[PDB]
Amino acid sequence: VAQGPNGRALAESMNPDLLSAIQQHISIERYASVTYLAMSIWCAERELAGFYQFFDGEAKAEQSHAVHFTQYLIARSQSNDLQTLDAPRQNWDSLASLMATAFQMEADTTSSIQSVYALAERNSDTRTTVFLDPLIEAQIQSEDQFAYLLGRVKFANGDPTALLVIDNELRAGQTQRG
Amino acid sequence: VAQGPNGRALAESMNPDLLSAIQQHISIERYASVTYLAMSIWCAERELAGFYQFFDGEAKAEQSHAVHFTQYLIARSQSNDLQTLDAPRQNWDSLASLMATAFQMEADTTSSIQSVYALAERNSDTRTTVFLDPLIEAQIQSEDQFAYLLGRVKFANGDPTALLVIDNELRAGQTQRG
Amino acid sequence: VAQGPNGRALAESMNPDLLSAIQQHISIERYASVTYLAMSIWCAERELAGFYQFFDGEAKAEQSHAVHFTQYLIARSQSNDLQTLDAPRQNWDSLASLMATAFQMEADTTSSIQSVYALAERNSDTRTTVFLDPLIEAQIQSEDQFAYLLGRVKFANGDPTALLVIDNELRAGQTQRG
Amino acid sequence: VAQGPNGRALAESMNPDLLSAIQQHISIERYASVTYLAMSIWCAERELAGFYQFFDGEAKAEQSHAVHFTQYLIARSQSNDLQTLDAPRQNWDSLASLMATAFQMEADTTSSIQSVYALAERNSDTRTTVFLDPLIEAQIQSEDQFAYLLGRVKFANGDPTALLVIDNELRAGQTQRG
Ligand SMILES: [Cl-]
Ligand SMILES: [Cl-]
Ligand SMILES: [Cl-]
Ligand SMILES: [Cl-]
Ligand SMILES: [Fe+3]
Ligand SMILES: [Fe+3]
Ligand SMILES: [Fe+3]
Ligand SMILES: [Fe+3]
Ligand SMILES: [Fe+3]
Ligand SMILES: [Fe+3]
Ligand SMILES: [Fe+3]
Ligand SMILES: [Fe+3]
Ligand SMILES: [Fe+3]
Ligand SMILES: [Fe+3]
């Protein structure tokens, strides 16, 4: 029985480029988390309490996703390397602009996963593609959700009354098409 | 005991023009179903989740109506003839325009039933008029309902804020005058 | 943020050949639905009430599968294109012949999914392969189920007594090997 | 306020031909009742206990239908005239032959109602057509049911094993397509 780079018994070695890509993706998830925290603060500063609660929960969810990836590296007997985290964007001219950044952040999180997926396929790492499959599934739902929230906010066309209505939807937990 | 055209024991023969009219009406119900599916998709594409849920349910209801008619032909020992189904309309310039097509589709479904009803009366087919009576009753309620939804959407006069409010009514199941 | 062909925010563009293949597959699911409806009617005409109830439920299930695909296109910000639907087959010389068509229809539904799957792999569309994976899993179970029903009906070898016994199994919901 | 022929206050006079037709129809219902009793006895004599229980219940149901008609005449302030009742048929060569007589009896009961219906329409007696409407509805279901039982017995093709299976279905209350 061989020992992996993190010291645990090694079921199968992992290509170092794939390892680096997973460690980098963990940073992407952590950065999405602090970005959603920053968005929750922006909404709270404008009394958009429902949007604030939504993004506060998304920040915690994205952090959980990052930890889920750290656990996979542990399971593969690979080292984690928690990286410096950039400061998030913190200023937006409108809720519609913020929601566009949020949608792009969600799509970019999926692109990061897709990049890791392709590397695993090139290295025939079927454990990693299996691990990623349900995360891509979740990303489809999150992209559908964020397209819904962005599209609904854009439909409001900057009308405060419509934005108050949507804010109350989010406070109630009405955050998807259903 | 005679055998009917579908092979079962025949309680009373049915005029072939009336049979053809019922088979055609089943197509009308099936076409209303796929039309409501198309309308549900149009609403989902615009984040009108309550309208989407409403029309998704109406599509399933109209299909059930079609099956209800197929069961009547079985009960009368008559052959079913499931027909080619046209593609539905799929593009509208506004929710108000979509709701006008929906109302017209409901009224046209009733006109189809009325045409079958008149043919049954000309042929003294009292089983068929009795079968249709409760379906006409249901159509009165559906026409009242769709006039309500169309009228409420028109009252909104294209204001996104009012349409968001109505959308949430539909999501909650508030779809009739009550 | 770019807008997709259906107007929603676009997480990632989809190759038009893959889009066409998904729209065509939706037609396959809708056609399986109306085929199972036709089979349910054939069984009802012969007093095979358990087979009638089984195929009535399968028709509703296949329609749900089609709608599930329409929702995926919405989630990917792609246009739906609901197509003309052919009339189903409606005549069979025996229950065994009907069950053979049913098995073939289920296998052909899987082949359609497999064709879409291969196109997604050629286009590196990992969202689509992830979306399809559980549907292939369900198809394995449905193929196993339909091979079971077909094989059991063939074992009966046209004996009405055995077919009545199997009919009652289906009425009770005994439709798989278990 | 005028008094009707049975002595009660008269809401609206009834044409004597229509009255005679209703009194005759009551005899038809009573005759269906004793016919089903005779059929229940025939089945009991052959140990077909499920068929016996079914027809015993149908005999009681048909009697209830007759009483329902006597109550309508009371409600219309018309005289009842309970008539001599013929002896039922009591001999059949096979269960299939018995079931054919049963189906014909059910269809003939509907024809009797239809004859009364047409007379009421000629006399513009809307109370009577309204009274008869739900009874025709029930007849559609009974005709569907008896076509089901007859067709299933014919499918058995005289095989005692299949007839025992069907007998047990009836004992369990499985008497319709469902
Ligand atoms: Cl805004
Ligand atoms: Cl509008
Ligand atoms: Cl067979
Ligand atoms: Cl027999
Ligand atoms: Fe994440
Ligand atoms: Fe995310
Ligand atoms: Fe309908
Ligand atoms: Fe309708
Ligand atoms: Fe009525
Ligand atoms: Fe399917
Ligand atoms: Fe299938
Ligand atoms: Fe999977
Ligand atoms: Fe009766
Ligand atoms: Fe009867």
XYZ file of C-alpha atoms and ligand atoms in Angstrom:
726
model
C 0.000 0.000 0.000
C 1.401 3.360 -1.099
C 0.918 6.637 0.769
C -0.556 9.606 -1.051
C 0.799 13.141 -0.978
C -1.336 14.058 2.054
C -0.042 10.989 3.921
C -3.123 8.752 3.747
C -3.222 5.372 2.008
C -3.465 5.966 -1.747
C -6.179 4.251 -3.776
C -4.936 5.693 -7.071
C -2.487 8.440 -7.951
C -3.789 11.739 -9.318
C -2.141 13.713 -12.105
C -0.580 16.913 -10.655
C -2.229 19.175 -13.249
C -5.639 17.825 -12.238
C -4.773 18.338 -8.567
C -3.769 21.940 -9.253
C -7.014 22.488 -11.154
C -9.103 21.214 -8.233
C -7.211 23.364 -5.741
C -7.807 26.354 -8.004
C -11.487 25.508 -8.301
C -11.819 25.498 -4.507
C -10.606 29.103 -4.683
C -13.328 29.854 -7.264
C -15.981 28.493 -4.890
C -14.540 30.465 -1.976
C -14.484 33.586 -4.133
C -18.107 33.066 -5.161
C -18.908 32.848 -1.454
C -17.328 36.156 -0.518
C -18.835 37.757 -3.649
C -22.315 36.713 -2.557
C -21.540 38.064 0.924
C -20.614 41.396 -0.674
C -23.830 41.318 -2.691
C -25.867 40.593 0.438
C -24.301 43.663 2.086
C -25.065 45.851 -0.959
C -28.708 44.776 -0.816
C -28.891 45.323 2.954
C -27.532 48.861 2.481
C -30.510 49.587 0.206
C -33.133 47.958 2.481
C -33.579 45.095 0.000
C -33.992 42.642 2.860
C -35.208 39.713 0.778
C -32.252 39.975 -1.597
C -30.000 40.346 1.438
C -31.332 37.123 2.963
C -31.049 35.297 -0.360
C -27.411 36.233 -0.931
C -26.497 35.575 2.699
C -27.696 32.006 2.184
C -25.915 31.691 -1.168
C -22.648 32.771 0.474
C -22.973 29.971 3.021
C -23.907 27.488 0.279
C -20.865 28.331 -1.848
C -18.603 27.911 1.166
C -20.139 24.469 1.732
C -19.362 23.617 -1.900
C -15.723 24.571 -1.338
C -15.513 22.366 1.749
C -17.112 19.532 -0.240
C -14.184 19.786 -2.664
C -11.618 19.819 0.165
C -13.170 16.577 1.424
C -12.762 14.966 -2.000
C -9.042 15.767 -2.031
C -8.785 14.211 1.440
C -10.625 11.130 0.142
C -8.174 10.874 -2.778
C -5.220 11.190 -0.346
C -4.187 14.451 -2.018
C -2.952 17.631 -0.393
C -5.177 20.659 -0.038
C -3.668 24.091 -0.668
C -5.956 26.850 0.595
C -5.015 29.966 -1.335
C -5.037 33.709 -0.904
C -8.556 34.996 -1.583
C -9.066 38.175 -3.612
C -11.345 40.911 -2.342
C -14.785 40.729 -3.990
C -16.434 43.336 -6.133
C -18.474 45.564 -3.845
C -20.038 48.354 -5.920
C -22.909 48.246 -8.404
C -25.012 50.995 -9.970
C -28.291 49.049 -9.756
C -29.834 45.790 -8.614
C -30.031 44.692 -12.262
C -26.275 45.197 -12.612
C -25.649 43.241 -9.404
C -27.865 40.399 -10.592
C -25.951 40.299 -13.891
C -22.678 39.891 -11.999
C -24.322 37.182 -9.879
C -25.473 35.264 -12.959
C -22.027 35.571 -14.530
C -20.401 34.352 -11.309
C -22.642 31.277 -11.325
C -21.898 30.558 -14.998
C -18.158 31.043 -14.371
C -18.308 28.608 -11.450
C -19.748 26.033 -13.850
C -17.057 26.779 -16.452
C -14.422 26.120 -13.790
C -16.026 22.749 -13.024
C -16.203 21.987 -16.752
C -12.478 22.718 -17.079
C -11.682 20.308 -14.234
C -14.047 17.761 -15.808
C -12.254 17.879 -19.158
C -8.868 17.458 -17.487
C -10.157 14.433 -15.574
C -11.447 12.903 -18.808
C -8.076 13.446 -20.480
C -6.483 11.626 -17.538
C -9.168 8.892 -17.400
C -9.903 9.863 -13.779
C -13.370 8.364 -13.491
C -13.557 8.990 -9.743
C -13.305 12.711 -10.449
C -15.892 12.823 -13.243
C -18.317 10.846 -11.046
C -17.646 13.245 -8.161
C -18.296 16.251 -10.411
C -21.441 14.940 -12.131
C -23.924 15.869 -9.342
C -22.203 19.231 -8.921
C -22.809 20.025 -12.587
C -26.423 18.957 -12.066
C -26.692 21.429 -9.187
C -25.098 24.111 -11.361
C -27.784 23.655 -14.030
C -30.415 24.353 -11.386
C -28.521 27.353 -9.985
C -28.059 28.821 -13.477
C -31.785 28.370 -14.136
C -32.486 30.033 -10.780
C -30.166 32.990 -11.337
C -31.482 33.495 -14.875
C -34.926 33.603 -13.273
C -33.966 36.195 -10.655
C -32.032 38.312 -13.148
C -34.806 38.147 -15.737
C -37.453 39.059 -13.179
C -35.428 42.040 -11.941
C -34.884 43.207 -15.527
C -38.621 42.879 -16.225
C -39.157 45.296 -13.324
C -37.240 47.840 -15.450
C -35.982 49.784 -12.431
C -39.441 50.444 -10.973
C -39.045 50.540 -7.156
C -42.559 49.157 -6.676
C -41.807 46.056 -8.733
C -38.462 45.632 -6.968
C -40.192 45.767 -3.573
C -42.582 43.043 -4.731
C -39.697 40.851 -5.889
C -37.792 41.583 -2.667
C -40.723 40.234 -0.652
C -40.832 37.127 -2.877
C -37.218 36.410 -1.998
C -37.836 37.024 1.708
C -40.606 34.402 1.518
C -38.227 31.912 -0.141
C -39.824 32.252 -3.596
C -36.551 32.145 -5.504
C -37.129 29.797 -8.465
C -39.645 29.193 -11.229
C -40.933 26.184 -9.335
C -76.185 -9.349 -29.018
C -74.424 -7.412 -31.776
C -70.757 -6.404 -31.729
C -69.830 -2.765 -32.175
C -67.148 -1.433 -34.493
C -64.468 -1.687 -31.782
C -65.440 -5.322 -31.131
C -67.270 -4.939 -27.809
C -70.937 -5.787 -27.272
C -73.043 -2.969 -28.735
C -75.734 -1.311 -26.630
C -76.873 0.952 -29.471
C -75.393 1.852 -32.834
C -73.913 5.313 -33.361
C -74.308 7.362 -36.527
C -70.939 7.532 -38.369
C -71.059 11.329 -38.731
C -71.442 11.663 -34.961
C -68.565 9.226 -34.436
C -66.354 11.252 -36.773
C -67.303 14.433 -34.921
C -66.310 12.938 -31.560
C -63.002 11.670 -32.925
C -62.342 15.146 -34.304
C -63.243 16.731 -30.984
C -60.693 14.528 -29.209
C -58.130 16.129 -31.526
C -59.379 19.584 -30.457
C -58.832 18.671 -26.798
C -55.379 17.267 -27.552
C -54.537 20.418 -29.491
C -55.690 22.621 -26.616
C -53.363 20.592 -24.404
C -50.260 21.136 -26.500
C -51.227 24.807 -26.973
C -51.331 25.305 -23.213
C -47.967 23.526 -22.966
C -46.573 26.004 -25.503
C -48.061 28.874 -23.512
C -46.522 27.546 -20.297
C -43.115 27.513 -22.023
C -43.576 31.091 -23.295
C -44.347 32.248 -19.758
C -41.400 30.311 -18.306
C -39.085 31.983 -20.843
C -40.150 35.364 -19.426
C -39.868 34.339 -15.742
C -43.663 34.437 -15.371
C -43.546 31.424 -13.075
C -47.136 31.631 -11.867
C -48.487 31.743 -15.418
C -46.115 28.906 -16.283
C -47.486 26.749 -13.462
C -51.072 27.605 -14.395
C -50.692 26.636 -18.049
C -48.704 23.512 -17.189
C -51.707 22.356 -15.167
C -54.167 23.345 -17.901
C -52.194 21.271 -20.418
C -52.543 18.204 -18.203
C -56.244 18.939 -17.645
C -56.998 19.194 -21.367
C -55.223 15.900 -21.983
C -57.408 14.318 -19.291
C -60.474 15.684 -21.094
C -59.316 14.017 -24.312
C -58.849 10.688 -22.542
C -62.314 11.089 -21.002
C -63.704 11.243 -24.545
C -61.715 8.174 -25.646
C -63.285 6.284 -22.736
C -66.777 7.265 -23.887
C -66.131 5.837 -27.355
C -64.925 2.625 -25.692
C -68.111 2.574 -23.592
C -70.222 2.983 -26.750
C -68.284 0.128 -28.434
C -66.990 2.554 -31.068
C -63.523 2.771 -32.555
C -61.099 5.474 -31.526
C -58.965 7.105 -34.216
C -56.126 9.116 -32.685
C -55.116 11.665 -35.293
C -52.067 13.605 -36.360
C -51.651 16.598 -34.043
C -50.691 19.995 -35.467
C -47.865 21.983 -33.935
C -49.184 24.677 -31.572
C -48.746 28.396 -31.874
C -45.601 29.327 -29.977
C -44.981 33.067 -30.385
C -46.798 36.034 -28.863
C -45.875 39.709 -28.597
C -47.233 40.123 -25.052
C -48.895 38.291 -22.190
C -52.173 40.025 -23.082
C -51.959 38.605 -26.606
C -51.219 35.131 -25.230
C -54.162 35.346 -22.844
C -56.425 36.360 -25.743
C -55.379 33.253 -27.669
C -55.977 31.186 -24.521
C -59.495 32.575 -24.099
C -60.258 31.960 -27.770
C -58.946 28.396 -27.492
C -61.269 27.755 -24.547
C -64.265 29.242 -26.383
C -63.406 27.208 -29.504
C -63.229 24.032 -27.414
C -66.779 24.760 -26.257
C -67.932 25.436 -29.833
C -66.562 22.029 -30.826
C -68.562 20.398 -28.022
C -71.647 22.369 -29.076
C -71.251 21.082 -32.640
C -71.088 17.482 -31.398
C -74.077 18.187 -29.136
C -76.217 19.424 -32.024
C -75.327 16.388 -34.129
C -76.290 14.082 -31.261
C -79.630 15.867 -30.910
C -80.289 15.492 -34.635
C -79.608 11.766 -34.236
C -81.586 11.458 -30.966
C -78.438 10.147 -29.242
C -79.420 10.874 -25.656
C -76.429 8.999 -24.238
C -74.160 11.494 -25.977
C -76.020 14.637 -24.894
C -76.042 13.355 -21.292
C -72.311 12.617 -21.540
C -71.631 16.121 -22.874
C -73.824 18.046 -20.413
C -71.307 18.130 -17.505
C -68.510 18.955 -19.942
C -70.415 22.022 -21.126
C -70.925 22.932 -17.467
C -67.163 22.725 -16.937
C -66.624 24.836 -20.054
C -68.820 27.617 -18.646
C -66.573 27.734 -15.590
C -63.377 27.644 -17.670
C -64.646 30.448 -19.926
C -65.501 32.515 -16.841
C -62.022 31.758 -15.483
C -60.172 32.646 -18.680
C -62.219 35.830 -19.109
C -61.128 36.668 -15.567
C -57.429 36.061 -16.232
C -57.515 37.863 -19.576
C -59.443 40.812 -18.159
C -57.097 41.115 -15.195
C -54.023 41.049 -17.443
C -55.575 43.693 -19.706
C -56.367 45.861 -16.669
C -52.636 45.746 -15.882
C -52.159 47.579 -19.211
C -48.660 46.188 -19.758
C -47.261 47.448 -16.444
C -44.602 44.918 -15.320
C -45.369 45.617 -11.657
C -49.028 44.693 -12.067
C -48.078 41.619 -14.100
C -45.721 40.470 -11.332
C -48.559 40.825 -8.825
C -50.897 38.773 -11.016
C -48.140 36.211 -11.630
C -47.834 35.671 -7.877
C -51.629 35.292 -7.614
C -51.487 32.459 -10.125
C -48.543 30.825 -8.349
C -50.662 30.832 -5.172
C -53.568 29.179 -7.025
C -55.686 32.359 -7.125
C -56.986 31.800 -10.641
C -60.729 32.567 -10.519
C -63.094 35.234 -9.244
C -64.057 32.950 -6.389
C -24.184 38.800 -19.893
C -25.426 37.456 -23.226
C -29.031 36.518 -23.989
C -29.811 33.048 -25.273
C -32.043 32.228 -28.220
C -35.144 32.002 -26.000
C -34.355 35.428 -24.510
C -33.102 34.386 -21.064
C -29.591 35.055 -19.767
C -27.224 32.536 -21.369
C -24.898 30.462 -19.199
C -23.261 28.767 -22.188
C -24.141 28.552 -25.861
C -25.455 25.280 -27.283
C -24.501 23.870 -30.670
C -27.510 24.111 -33.050
C -27.268 20.452 -34.107
C -27.518 19.396 -30.461
C -30.482 21.734 -29.969
C -32.236 20.229 -32.988
C -31.560 16.738 -31.648
C -33.126 17.577 -28.278
C -36.179 19.137 -29.909
C -36.541 16.001 -32.020
C -36.185 13.795 -28.961
C -39.032 15.658 -27.251
C -41.143 14.572 -30.228
C -40.035 10.957 -29.648
C -41.204 11.161 -26.025
C -44.503 12.740 -27.065
C -44.956 10.033 -29.685
C -44.266 7.301 -27.134
C -46.965 8.907 -24.996
C -49.662 8.825 -27.648
C -48.569 5.298 -28.646
C -49.089 4.086 -25.088
C -52.476 5.840 -25.073
C -53.384 3.917 -28.235
C -52.204 0.695 -26.610
C -54.282 1.407 -23.505
C -57.352 1.826 -25.739
C -56.625 -1.449 -27.577
C -56.440 -3.275 -24.249
C -59.620 -1.604 -22.969
C -61.449 -2.721 -26.130
C -60.582 -6.327 -25.230
C -61.495 -6.023 -21.518
C -57.814 -6.252 -20.542
C -58.365 -3.734 -17.763
C -55.025 -4.227 -16.032
C -53.096 -3.679 -19.261
C -55.335 -0.690 -19.952
C -54.492 0.865 -16.581
C -50.787 0.145 -17.045
C -50.564 1.802 -20.457
C -52.719 4.735 -19.360
C -50.117 5.433 -16.679
C -47.217 4.946 -19.100
C -48.774 7.496 -21.468
C -48.852 10.075 -18.680
C -45.286 9.187 -17.660
C -43.914 9.637 -21.182
C -45.614 13.017 -21.444
C -43.937 14.018 -18.171
C -40.590 12.973 -19.662
C -41.219 15.244 -22.649
C -42.031 18.180 -20.378
C -38.867 17.434 -18.384
C -36.900 17.939 -21.606
C -38.726 21.194 -22.417
C -37.698 22.466 -18.977
C -34.047 21.667 -19.692
C -34.125 23.743 -22.881
C -35.645 26.597 -20.860
C -32.857 26.192 -18.284
C -30.241 26.361 -21.063
C -31.915 29.517 -22.469
C -32.709 27.662 -25.698
C -35.873 27.791 -27.760
C -38.391 24.980 -27.689
C -40.016 23.930 -30.961
C -43.039 21.710 -30.342
C -43.555 19.725 -33.522
C -46.349 18.075 -35.437
C -47.099 14.701 -33.840
C -47.751 11.656 -36.029
C -50.762 9.457 -35.402
C -49.814 6.339 -33.412
C -50.134 2.755 -34.490
C -53.538 1.529 -33.361
C -54.019 -2.053 -34.577
C -52.434 -5.286 -33.368
C -53.328 -8.928 -33.970
C -52.578 -10.036 -30.393
C -51.450 -8.814 -26.995
C -48.041 -10.398 -27.640
C -47.684 -8.325 -30.813
C -48.701 -5.168 -28.940
C -46.197 -5.884 -26.180
C -43.463 -6.360 -28.798
C -44.222 -2.925 -30.241
C -44.195 -1.510 -26.700
C -40.775 -3.011 -25.968
C -39.417 -1.717 -29.272
C -40.815 1.749 -28.540
C -39.030 1.776 -25.180
C -35.744 0.619 -26.738
C -36.101 3.227 -29.510
C -36.678 5.946 -26.911
C -33.361 4.952 -25.336
C -31.614 4.955 -28.730
C -32.852 8.511 -29.267
C -31.379 9.541 -25.908
C -28.129 7.759 -26.787
C -27.942 9.711 -30.054
C -28.370 13.009 -28.190
C -25.792 11.835 -25.636
C -23.178 11.139 -28.307
C -23.752 14.537 -29.910
C -23.321 16.234 -26.533
C -20.058 14.361 -25.975
C -18.790 15.431 -29.395
C -19.589 19.023 -28.410
C -18.193 18.666 -24.856
C -21.606 19.673 -23.466
C -21.228 18.258 -19.973
C -24.445 19.875 -18.744
C -26.349 17.796 -21.285
C -24.646 14.474 -20.528
C -25.250 15.042 -16.795
C -28.898 15.874 -17.520
C -29.288 12.702 -19.595
C -27.507 10.306 -17.216
C -30.475 9.707 -14.842
C -32.809 9.411 -17.826
C -30.683 6.597 -19.239
C -30.779 4.994 -15.790
C -34.579 5.157 -15.868
C -34.554 3.692 -19.378
C -32.580 0.657 -18.181
C -35.305 -0.006 -15.625
C -38.108 0.532 -18.155
C -36.433 -1.808 -20.661
C -36.073 -4.441 -17.930
C -39.743 -3.902 -17.056
C -41.016 -4.130 -20.627
C -38.875 -7.206 -21.309
C -40.530 -8.689 -18.227
C -44.074 -7.906 -19.375
C -43.400 -9.035 -22.940
C -41.688 -12.232 -21.811
C -44.493 -13.059 -19.396
C -47.147 -12.513 -22.073
C -45.194 -14.700 -24.508
C -44.888 -17.422 -21.853
C -48.699 -17.399 -21.697
C -48.581 -18.552 -25.347
C -51.961 -17.026 -26.196
C -53.876 -18.874 -23.468
C -56.726 -16.562 -22.342
C -56.573 -17.963 -18.805
C -52.913 -17.037 -18.411
C -53.558 -13.615 -19.947
C -56.365 -12.980 -17.446
C -53.982 -13.855 -14.613
C -51.344 -11.460 -15.946
C -54.000 -8.783 -16.512
C -54.941 -8.967 -12.830
C -51.250 -8.708 -11.867
C -51.015 -5.444 -13.777
C -54.242 -4.133 -12.240
C -52.686 -4.783 -8.813
C -49.538 -2.853 -9.801
C -47.382 -5.989 -10.152
C -45.519 -4.788 -13.226
C -41.837 -5.626 -12.627
C -39.677 -8.526 -11.508
C -39.243 -6.847 -8.148
C -103.995 25.311 -6.406
C -105.136 22.247 -8.347
C -104.920 18.666 -7.088
C -103.113 16.076 -9.169
C -104.403 12.615 -10.004
C -102.792 11.100 -6.889
C -104.432 13.775 -4.712
C -101.402 15.953 -3.935
C -101.067 19.602 -4.952
C -100.188 19.735 -8.657
C -97.201 21.762 -9.835
C -97.850 20.998 -13.507
C -100.071 18.511 -15.294
C -98.505 15.514 -17.030
C -99.629 14.138 -20.379
C -101.359 10.746 -19.852
C -99.261 8.996 -22.517
C -96.092 10.071 -20.709
C -97.553 8.879 -17.402
C -98.368 5.492 -18.925
C -94.842 5.265 -20.323
C -93.294 5.921 -16.904
C -95.542 3.365 -15.223
C -94.526 0.855 -17.885
C -90.862 1.682 -17.392
C -91.172 0.960 -13.666
C -92.279 -2.525 -14.730
C -89.151 -2.812 -16.913
C -86.956 -1.975 -13.911
C -88.834 -4.445 -11.713
C -88.475 -7.093 -14.407
C -84.741 -6.445 -14.693
C -84.576 -6.954 -10.932
C -86.237 -10.354 -10.926
C -84.200 -11.350 -14.008
C -80.970 -10.591 -12.167
C -82.296 -12.572 -9.190
C -82.886 -15.520 -11.529
C -79.379 -15.109 -12.925
C -77.907 -15.032 -9.419
C -79.678 -18.334 -8.676
C -78.378 -19.910 -11.911
C -74.829 -18.943 -10.956
C -75.272 -20.204 -7.384
C -76.474 -23.564 -8.748
C -73.146 -23.889 -10.587
C -70.969 -22.769 -7.635
C -70.159 -19.491 -9.411
C -70.272 -17.639 -6.106
C -68.772 -14.386 -7.354
C -71.283 -14.139 -10.197
C -74.006 -15.048 -7.711
C -73.001 -12.199 -5.395
C -72.753 -9.766 -8.306
C -76.227 -10.516 -9.648
C -77.749 -10.550 -6.165
C -76.538 -6.969 -5.778
C -77.737 -5.989 -9.258
C -81.215 -7.309 -8.425
C -81.367 -5.055 -5.372
C -80.027 -2.108 -7.390
C -82.655 -2.478 -10.120
C -85.398 -2.606 -7.504
C -84.034 0.638 -6.039
C -84.205 2.183 -9.518
C -87.871 1.198 -9.769
C -88.632 2.774 -6.396
C -86.768 5.909 -7.508
C -89.243 6.173 -10.392
C -92.246 5.640 -8.094
C -90.981 8.556 -5.995
C -90.835 10.799 -9.065
C -94.484 10.079 -9.874
C -95.344 10.946 -6.261
C -93.363 14.188 -6.618
C -95.294 15.038 -9.803
C -98.608 14.311 -8.008
C -99.293 11.448 -10.423
C -100.731 8.036 -9.668
C -98.548 4.960 -9.532
C -99.873 1.738 -11.052
C -97.785 -1.250 -9.974
C -98.338 -3.922 -12.596
C -98.327 -7.678 -12.893
C -94.724 -8.868 -13.205
C -93.828 -11.608 -15.691
C -91.750 -14.573 -14.605
C -88.086 -14.135 -15.586
C -86.059 -16.310 -17.881
C -84.395 -18.968 -15.753
C -82.459 -21.334 -18.032
C -79.215 -20.799 -19.931
C -76.835 -23.231 -21.620
C -73.670 -21.416 -20.490
C -72.394 -18.461 -18.502
C -71.605 -16.689 -21.786
C -75.241 -17.056 -22.852
C -76.428 -15.741 -19.480
C -74.091 -12.761 -19.713
C -75.426 -11.999 -23.205
C -78.976 -11.908 -21.847
C -77.755 -9.682 -19.002
C -76.136 -7.229 -21.419
C -79.263 -7.173 -23.575
C -81.426 -6.567 -20.500
C -79.266 -3.583 -19.550
C -79.394 -2.161 -23.089
C -83.178 -2.696 -23.203
C -83.560 -0.869 -19.887
C -81.780 2.095 -21.473
C -83.984 1.905 -24.584
C -87.038 2.084 -22.325
C -85.641 5.219 -20.670
C -84.854 6.679 -24.099
C -88.459 6.085 -25.180
C -89.759 7.918 -22.101
C -87.206 10.680 -22.738
C -88.409 11.235 -26.302
C -92.034 11.384 -25.172
C -91.134 13.965 -22.527
C -89.344 16.065 -25.145
C -92.378 15.907 -27.431
C -94.472 17.156 -24.504
C -91.893 19.769 -23.398
C -91.760 18.110 -19.958
C -88.416 19.470 -18.811
C -88.850 18.133 -15.275
C -88.919 14.622 -16.713
C -85.899 15.004 -19.002
C -83.909 16.484 -16.092
C -85.015 13.588 -13.874
C -83.948 11.059 -16.517
C -80.580 12.623 -17.401
C -78.586 11.137 -14.465
C -80.298 7.785 -14.992
C -79.073 7.698 -18.587
C -75.615 8.588 -17.272
C -75.792 5.605 -14.916
C -76.955 3.416 -17.800
C -73.868 4.331 -19.843
C -71.706 3.097 -16.979
C -73.760 -0.085 -16.516
C -73.605 -0.849 -20.252
C -69.829 -0.341 -20.178
C -69.674 -2.627 -17.133
C -71.819 -5.384 -18.627
C -69.919 -5.224 -21.925
C -66.792 -5.693 -19.818
C -68.135 -8.722 -17.945
C -69.589 -10.290 -21.086
C -66.423 -9.678 -23.092
C -64.228 -11.107 -20.349
C -66.383 -14.235 -20.062
C -66.298 -14.686 -23.846
C -62.504 -14.290 -23.830
C -62.422 -17.227 -21.398
C -63.913 -19.285 -24.263
C -65.628 -21.751 -21.928
C -62.452 -22.734 -20.063
C -63.482 -23.553 -16.457
C -60.122 -22.345 -15.138
C -60.568 -18.896 -16.659
C -64.168 -18.763 -15.433
C -63.030 -19.574 -11.885
C -60.525 -16.719 -12.082
C -63.210 -14.298 -13.266
C -65.616 -15.603 -10.610
C -63.087 -14.713 -7.911
C -62.657 -11.239 -9.450
C -66.379 -10.645 -9.068
C -66.382 -11.968 -5.498
C -63.662 -9.403 -4.716
C -65.770 -6.603 -6.242
C -63.610 -6.301 -9.380
C -66.518 -5.777 -11.754
C -65.490 -2.914 -14.071
C -62.556 -1.834 -16.205
C -61.653 0.735 -13.581
Cl -32.610 47.678 -11.158
Cl -49.281 42.419 -21.441
Cl -51.128 -13.014 -26.998
Cl -69.199 -19.873 -20.859
Fe -20.583 26.500 -5.855
Fe -22.790 29.043 -7.385
Fe -61.049 20.474 -22.565
Fe -60.255 24.060 -22.127
Fe -77.590 17.185 -16.447
Fe -39.699 8.544 -21.906
Fe -40.496 4.954 -22.302
Fe -24.474 10.330 -12.584
Fe -82.291 0.091 -13.691
Fe -79.817 -2.148 -15.287
